[PDB]
Write a protein that binds this DNA or RNA. Structure first.
Lengths: 400, 401, 400, 399
DNA sequence: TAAGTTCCTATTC
DNA sequence: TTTAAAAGAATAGGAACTT
DNA sequence: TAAGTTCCTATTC
DNA sequence: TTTAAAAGAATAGGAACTT
DNA sequence: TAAGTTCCTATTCTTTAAAAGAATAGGAACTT
DNA sequence: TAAGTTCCTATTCTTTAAAAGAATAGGAACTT
């Protein structure tokens, strides 16, 4: 894609190509400066600091949509997310003195506004009210989860896809993370970590998150119909490692858990199977549904205090400076969080305790037996995902 | 009304009509651009963002009053609530290049004047309004006593039952919720629900979305001890007024969601104010431009203050400090306003009054025999609109008493 | 005083007199424009809004100290608490076009700065620490109160003064109010109000307070050697009604409780008798001691919640719009406040209750007997202070 | 030092000396105006407001490094942290009309440069520091384990007892209070008090006023369970170091109040850092410009975060948030280690370990008639509250 | 010996 | 690190007279 | 009959 | 009445191809 | 007398805005 | 088939600046 290409082009070459466009003034040539113009405007306002894919993408669009120019008077303007327009205009000019630039703050023309209105005239909150309904009716969060999960069971056209959809969904719910949170997981960071309520849980790491604050992603045995480890198994056995896509203009992590485009097909599917009204609403949550469900679950269950941590929201109860530079360790999802989500335990608002449900299978005890042929079951991830892990999962699976 | 019409006219048509006015320059034609000019100036400064009724109304007036023009020199000016006049003038011109526009800031001191003015005062309605309000609560009567009085002032002056019902309902409604007329008026009748309350058993709760500051809030109704009972007036209301189709109140064309009904009629306020004005159960109500339908809101604000519960004011009155965000009122608020309990400043808890009648218990009895879908019989007008579960509760409560 | 005179002069006359000063340019004449110049600058920046005494006083001084002028070049300047100097200068000029004005913001040049420093180089916190000591030591608040109170008992040169000092002091303490709070009480507003702990208490009203937020002042029977009603009695029988002084270039209230100058005489006394170190410190609290003491009492007793109300400090729990426009009734001093300060009861931080002290005289019961002549004991306030009140006090007194 | 001298020189004298430099235009003379030029530029932009040591120091350097001039054209320029350069230049000139001044903003981008720079990177500070810090806590050891290690790294490397005492005291001190060096150093020794705390009986509390952000805060010392005990290091400290006369740190020269004593010596930090640097009990400490004395602060910030108690961070560490505030009771409960925090209930739980600090306080508070505190800590006798010196003295022997 | 200081300069919060 | 300055309205004090 | 309405304008929050 | 605007970095959607 | 007053001046508190937007209150001629 | 992909564009999150001040860390030449 354009961005990948930008990343492949040498700085001087970019600047080079940008100038050539203005030597033999052509509409064909000036009309495409967009991508380059983006890179330049950024590099200027940030002094060589690399630019991230998404950002380049957004801005490129913004410029491309607003770009306009007069070849005769050598004047070109466009919109950009900035407030020090002048400084930028000056810079651009030094590069092409013969021209006049005019950067317009992103943040109009009547006839446009009008037609736009005249258009609408002929045609978020809704989704929030719909989610409320979805929840505030017959079933529970878990019941809803299973339903959504099952809506893929028969509709999917391939096994990989069915596997991917269900894995992703459940994954996003369990961790209250975004698509990108699950997608950018470094497969080589899978570990078994202890948890006083479940014996052990699988933990991996995501670094390239939205707010650039690393967090862990977990997988663990759950009681009942829905079991993460199971979907994790099905996942591993149908999808293979993905080479970490480059997401910024610069110059280490060779793999990523899912494919960047999984989200489109996922959303598209979730949209069609529409296991609930909410999913019909255009621009309504899609992949993000997982996140909202767990946020609600925690609330409804009376544990909002965990939400921020589980979901990874910069915590404001601590001075920014105190976080930015005096804290050196990815905050921990508290032990009991998993206890609850695993369903082998319940929460007593009064006794402020986890009450192990009298199910016959004890999560801890069963771990012991397992701890007391992995590389064979998951050949694709063999050599990538820790063997210690591949074994645990392999066992756990057969062990059932 | 003009606004409704604006909402019915297609964008291009509006712009169209606005231009035609300047083709065959006529006083008749240019003098009416007002409404259109308003729409345009807004759309420009807000980039397609819809405009609310009230706002359009205010601005339309402002322009209309200030509009002036020279057909010969093709120059037209008017006032508008803006500070980037130039940008706007430019825009207007592109639409009609042949003309010159001049937007004058709505918002933008000579000694000798000031002096003479003072020299005038030295020798011999608003600051008066606030005095009477202080007075009102300053004299003997308690808030509740005042409320009952005002309430009764409609009892024998109203010309119809509907009106008597409406006035008393509205008044008590606004007091109980410390809400504005619009708060009660824009309630979505289809949102009535029974909600539990540890002090009164249950209370009726509805929802208002189209509020002034566009911050949704709930409106409540509940059993109260004594001669004034909300549920009773709610009953009388329901049995004399009917659902009202939600009026459109902004240029958009959103035909999605948007509640289909509203609790009261937009014009109720005029007749209400007018009545409250004439019956003038108190001096305050005589003062021109003094509070009228708003009185309810001042009373509760004062009640809360005087009682030492200002912490609730902001929430109750709804002022600024994936959930469809809305904040309700604390449980004990109703406990107090219902009068079945008393507030203890020292402990800060709500204390029930050893008066035999304990509200909670009476709710139980009512909740016990259901199946008596007799609610839908007493309130036929709201049948199908207001939750049956609610219509039953009220119906029972009423008969049960 | 100058201010009173200003209030007596007609607007046009003032402006008149101000101009005459500049017709026959005289140092004598221009040097006195001060008072007038103040009035004008205010009226301008506030558009006819009346000006309060204190404010006029402060500003008059500020101008007077900074006023300077050149009769030859017709240029005059002075300092004033403003930031829109120009607007003001323009206005002044229209009144006297022949002149040039220059308003200098109240709230530079090196050589000045330097000399200033060179000056300092050669030459509040204390009082706060001293108060801490005063408190954070042996004697209790009440013990301290009695001592201070007694320090006037013999030092005073007259009975009226001894009465005034002791009344004022105890008054300010009981109500945690300033001098002005006690002084500006409308004597015609005395009432008997019920209180479920003491039977009844005397309540009066102050409107002309600093923050212009009316509040009530109380008097009540107290257990022990210090009894408000007693000092209230002694007060009433030695001082007389005071004509409400005008305090704004304007409102109705024909009388005020104390004389405006009582404070000087009071401070001066409290200063000399210095019953405590604190009172020696220049500019340290004088009449204000009473407030501080109660503020501390409430805190120390664990009842800060009452402080704001009792002392009257703008509520911050309700939007200003709400406080301003909609709140129409003075928040009420909670019932138990008096219970505590009266000393017939104690406060239990745990049980959150007032515990009546087993004293033999029940405040409530004794009220009954009294409720089951006054115009003779308090002839001066006869016709001014409610008879119902004069009787209650009269009785209570004799009844002892 | 230069700063102390500035503080000793009379205003008019300074301005005097500054002008003389320009009368007989000399490279020798103009080249030294630096310190004076600093004082002037500040006094101007702040109108007589005194200037703090550190600030003067920083600015003096900035000017000194940037100062340049032409004796022939009588033109002199330098950098300064300002944005209203002109106003300042004008002022300076009035003082020396014959000259032309040009104040250059300390804080600021040519494309072609940027580009080439990028074109360069395309082919092939804290960063490393922040990696090790992550590492530190990432590896095995717990915060407390790390603390003890660092603490012990001084035990045998120190060349004197005073120094060994100082280092260990300071370190543990900074950690317990999550304060800066200056926070511990500027404590007014005469402000020590024994305050009650429903979880440990009592704790020692002192006061610091001259803090970085000029927001006073308290510094505490208390009994802790295990090998690491603050009271113990506090004891060792008191018995080897002595009161320090509060150094003047601002050209305010206001004669009154101002505590006369400071807890530690201003230069303790250099040696401390230098030591911590060499003993490098951990990789982190090797990184140049990486945290050193500060380490204690970072540890507690992390401790609180990791423990799920960030709500306490701002208070404990003294950062701006929305009668100087003071640490919640349970904070000490936790750091003392006699109690454990329960995330689910959110209460502090004492450990069934026999030694209940509260009870042991009682015993100590009981048997009086022991002014023997003033005997163990003679140096601080008369400075540190006796009530305190007794408590510590007892506690110590009592163990 | 250096670890300690002393007194600026360089870095960081 | 951090981030509300100041208008406007009291309460002290100075000092020359009064009782 | 005048209280109630209709639809702007004037005021206030 | 109200009073954090917006840069920067995700997650939906559109639509023409692939299987 | 020197405490008690006058009448300014010097210090020290308390509380804060402006204006685009969006309601509520009033004016008049109509409606029932 | 259309579900599943590509590769942009359109919407919707998430957190916060810039720089004057004010400490802490380091450089070098001295010192106990």
């Amino acid at each position: 894609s354009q961005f990948d290409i930008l990343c492949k082009t040498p700085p001087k070459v970019l600047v080079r190509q940008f100038v050539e466009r203005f030597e033999r003034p052509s509409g064909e040539k000036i009309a495409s400066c967009a991508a380059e113009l983006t890179y330049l405007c950024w590099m200027i306002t940030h002094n060589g600091t690399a630019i991230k894919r998404a950002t380049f993408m957004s801005y490129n669009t913004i410029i491309s949509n607003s770009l306009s120019f007069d070849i005769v008077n050598k004047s070109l303007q466009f919109k950009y997310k900035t407030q020090k327009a002048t400084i930028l205009e000056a810079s651009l000019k030094k590069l092409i003195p013969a021209w006049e630039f005019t950067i317009i703050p992103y943040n109009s023309d009547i006839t446009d506004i009008v037609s736009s209105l005249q258009l609408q005239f002929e045609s978020n909150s809704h989704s929030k009210k719909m989610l409320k309904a979805l929840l505030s009716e017959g079933e529970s969060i878990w019941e809803i989860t299973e339903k959504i999960l099952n809506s893929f069971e028969y509709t999917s056209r391939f096994t990989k896809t069915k596997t991917l959809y269900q894995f992703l969904f459940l994954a996003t719910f369990i961790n209250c993370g975004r698509f990108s949170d699950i997608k950018n997981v470094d497969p080589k960071s899978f570990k078994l970590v202890q948890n006083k309520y479940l014996g052990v849980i699988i933990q991996c790491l995501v670094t390239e998150t939205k707010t650039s604050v690393s967090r862990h992603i977990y997988f663990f045995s759950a009681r009942g119909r829905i079991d993460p480890l199971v979907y994790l198994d099905e996942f591993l056995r149908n999808s293979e490692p993905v080479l970490k896509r480059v997401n910024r203009t610069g110059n280490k992590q060779e793999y990523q858990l899912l494919k960047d485009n999984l989200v489109r097909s996922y959303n598209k599917a979730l949209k069609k199977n529409a296991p609930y009204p909410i999913f019909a609403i255009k621009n309504g949550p899609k992949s993000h549904i997982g996140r909202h469900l767990m946020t609600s679950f925690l609330s409804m269950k009376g544990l909002t205090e965990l939400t921020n941590v589980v979901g990874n929201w910069s915590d404001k109860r601590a001075s920014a400076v105190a976080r930015t530079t005096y804290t050196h360790q990815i905050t921990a999802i508290p032990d009991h969080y998993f206890a609850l989500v695993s369903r082998y335990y319940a929460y007593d608002p009064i006794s402020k305790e986890m009450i192990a449900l009298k199910d016959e299978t004890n999560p801890i005890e069963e771990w012991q037996h397992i701890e007391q042929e992995g590389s064979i079951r998951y050949p694709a991830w063999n050599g990538i995902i820790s063997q210690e892990v591949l074994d645990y999962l392999s066992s756990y699976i057969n062990r059932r």
